[PDB]
Design a protein around this ligand. Sequence first.
Ligand SMILES: Cc1c(C)n(Cc2ccc(Cl)c(OCC(=O)O)c2)c2ccc(C(=O)NCc3ccc(C(C)(C)C)cc3)cc12
Ligand SMILES: Cc1c(C)n(Cc2ccc(Cl)c(OCC(=O)O)c2)c2ccc(C(=O)NCc3ccc(C(C)(C)C)cc3)cc12
Lengths: 263, 256
Amino acid sequence: ESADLRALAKHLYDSYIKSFPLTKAKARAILTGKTTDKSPFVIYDMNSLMMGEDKIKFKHITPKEVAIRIFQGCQFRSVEAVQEITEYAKSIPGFVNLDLNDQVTLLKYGVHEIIYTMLASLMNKDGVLISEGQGFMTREFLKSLRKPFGDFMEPKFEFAVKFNALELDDSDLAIFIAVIILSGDRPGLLNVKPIEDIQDNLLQALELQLKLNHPESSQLFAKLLQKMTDLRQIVTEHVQLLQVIKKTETDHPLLQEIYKDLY
Amino acid sequence: SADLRALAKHLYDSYIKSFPLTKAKARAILTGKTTDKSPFVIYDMNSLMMGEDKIKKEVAIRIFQGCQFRSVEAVQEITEYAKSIPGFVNLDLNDQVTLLKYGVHEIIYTMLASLMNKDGVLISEGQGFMTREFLKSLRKPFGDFMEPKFEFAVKFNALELDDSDLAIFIAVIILSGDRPGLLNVKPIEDIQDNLLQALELQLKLNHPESSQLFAKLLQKMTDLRQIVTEHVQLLQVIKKTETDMSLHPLLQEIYK
Ligand SMILES: Cc1c(C)n(Cc2ccc(Cl)c(OCC(=O)O)c2)c2ccc(C(=O)NCc3ccc(C(C)(C)C)cc3)cc12
Ligand SMILES: Cc1c(C)n(Cc2ccc(Cl)c(OCC(=O)O)c2)c2ccc(C(=O)NCc3ccc(C(C)(C)C)cc3)cc12
């Protein structure tokens, strides 16, 4: 069965690769200057953004204020992320054989956590990759947006730095992501047995992958599990904010229906 | 590996030495394993009337008031326990203070599960039982205050941890790298990294049936935090309203 856990691990990595265009390896390149291919357009102050939008050209333009056009771009891209993560989750052994109600429940509450995890791979302490890699937006500029949106992006940076210090690679993350999805304590799951049975195989595969790939750091597995509560914390804070954008900010119907804050 | 069993034993020893009401003892009282231990139930107002003569300001207030003064005696207790943990005394004194004052809520609720079942919680050092319903039949603000504790407890007690596990887990909680205000997090993580090494082995030997117990326990921190937040949120609504939530010298210095 040691031989199985190694293949569950290789299985998830391929799908992870097929499911997610912008991998951590590919991000970490763009960030360091590791390739001689392209380089990110940078967004450091109010000036830089102006010029950015022309050369960079985004998908989420909606012909508002700057800080709103960012938030919503974040949300557009997260709706994109959901479909990628929805594809990935189908590849996890057993998952599709689950009750459809549970499938939906698991994704519904899983996706925020998986987005913040993957966002860590696009960040360093100084900013974050945007627009499928082609841009870079500084942490300072994000911290300088107006009263509500100044703190928006900051908890994720705090987490990212802590998280990225574990130095995980995509193969480790592909298994970590499967674990978050198959979290058998989502509200309203109908049949928790097969969910935990699968989570149990995934943890065993994760545990083993971490040992072989990161032998130098003992209790990396435990360190990683602790970060699920960090992830979970960032989500309650994000729901805290979404409530005070509903209550204070003013917004098309079909745009707020595409970007339906699930809960 | 055998040097980790040694550490587990040390912690379990100082755990028993530091806390008078073990899980073990509480389970006996709640099951009636020999009946000189049988607790007095409080489930209504005449029961509470009778129970002040029986056991060791408005009524719902005076519950919360005693419910808080029991927690300061719990901090006294947790501080002793921390001091027994290899390394903790060697840290920057300021970190000691910090490390505790954040961890004390999280450990309280962990140990309070040991006092709890579906229907109620033990009070007055084991001597009493107070009903989940009678707790949540207090007229607000206080009618919501114990109910999230019961929710965590039932799902936490699910794991069936015995005291020799709770001791190590509670060590893990105290020594959190992620606390705000820590000068040297590095040494803090060096200890926790071993504690975790110890908790893992412990849980395979004591619970060999349970395959991902290690993982499933560590995951409970999320609930354990969620409940801690709700406590102060609530404790600040009472703050400006209630006359007069008066405080001990160890109450006030935790958040103000
Ligand atoms: C996936 C993702 C990325 C790549 N970023 C980085 C980012 C930062 C800044 C900008 Cl202007 C940005 O522009 C969009 C783009 O370049 O594609 C992207 C996120 C910044 C924030 C978030 C985020 O907080 N998502 C929360 C969220 C929002 C909505 C959902 C739904 C309702 C779709 C399920 C989930 C999670 C997600 C992302
Ligand atoms: C330790 C503890 C017990 C044994 N109970 C159950 C309980 C319920 C009802 C009553 Cl009347 C009660 O009486 C006290 C007693 O039994 O002697 C005990 C808690 C019920 C609630 C809480 C609780 O929510 N404590 C939170 C808290 C409050 C203050 C702190 C400080 C600020 C001192 C650090 C931490 C945590 C703790 C306990």
